[PDB]
Curated annotation (Swiss-Prot), chains A, B:
Protein's recorded name: Threonine--tRNA ligase
Annotated function: Catalyzes the attachment of threonine to tRNA(Thr) in a two-step reaction: L-threonine is first activated by ATP to form Thr-AMP and then transferred to the acceptor end of tRNA(Thr). Edits incorrectly charged L-seryl-tRNA(Thr) via its editing domain. Deacylates correctly charged glycyl-tRNA(Gly), but neither glycyl-tRNA(Gly)(2'-dA76) (the terminal 2'-OH of tRNA(Thr) adenine 76 has been replaced by hydrogen) nor the 2'-fluoro tRNA derivative do so, strongly suggesting the editing function is tRNA catalyzed.
Protein family: Belongs to the class-II aminoacyl-tRNA synthetase family.
Region annotation (Editing domain) ranges: 1-140
Cellular compartment(s): Cytoplasm
Notes on the domains: The N-terminal domain (about residues 1-143) is an archaea-specific tRNA-editing domain that has a highly similar structure to Dtd (D-aminoacyl-tRNA deacylase); the domain binds L-serine and L-cysteine and most D-amino acids but not L-threonine. Editing of incorrectly charged L-seryl-tRNA(Thr) by this domain is tRNA catalyzed.
Effect of H83A: Isolated domain has decreased to no deacylation of mischarged L-seryl-tRNA(Thr). Deacylates correctly charged glycyl-tRNA(Gly)
Subunit: Homodimer.
Amino acid sequence: MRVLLIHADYFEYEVKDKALKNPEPISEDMKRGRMEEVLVAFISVEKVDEKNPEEVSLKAIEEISKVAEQVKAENVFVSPWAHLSSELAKPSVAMDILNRVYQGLKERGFNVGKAPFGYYIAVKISCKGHPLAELSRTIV
Amino acid sequence: MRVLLIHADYFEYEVKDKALKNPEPISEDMKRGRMEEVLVAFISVEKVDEKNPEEVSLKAIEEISKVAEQVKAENVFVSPWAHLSSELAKPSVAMDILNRVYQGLKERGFNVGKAPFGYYIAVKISCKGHPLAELSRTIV
């Protein structure tokens, strides 16, 4: 798995078209969301992660947790993202791991948001620009 | 080299602290910039690119050009970015290639912006969310 972390003043999104033929169902509420003072985790779930979804999930949970604690973010947002890897896991594996990472951050005590899987999404983000505000991690 | 391309309604930035001890000099004007309807190229120049800066530059010029033409962007912004690679080129190599990619997009006919090298930068971006609006390319 590859992860890009962005410590943002705000992060806002609007679901546009479906990217999968059968995406994650969503309510009309879940078409748009916004959080402030948020660590945004853009996550590319990879083929190799099929091998051990829970180990990879636990690791991702922890690495994101550390950065949130370090930059003093209480808010965390989990986003699926294709763009840190050309070796992507099947959608079941991707949704599995995404949901585990989300549940684990909730259990850590963060106020966690997530994006629906299988859509094109419009995104507005304001990235802070202090030294720890954009970080990448590789998790295998 | 790895490149992330984002077709944006707008892209705005403010230079914050220096990341290098001796960054690219800038005027007080160049501390902030904004473009609209813009393809933003986040570029991670890599160690392997030292081997042949011009080939890699020409390739990057072309791949960014194709996407701009395809999404109908007249505006292109070139940004250095550490986050698509854990094998980064020295600053001379990085600045070299960045400047070549910038000059080549100018010669193609685009209205091109660039970000100063060696700083932490605060960024606001609105990503479109249509199918071609976020793309990655690997160039070696």
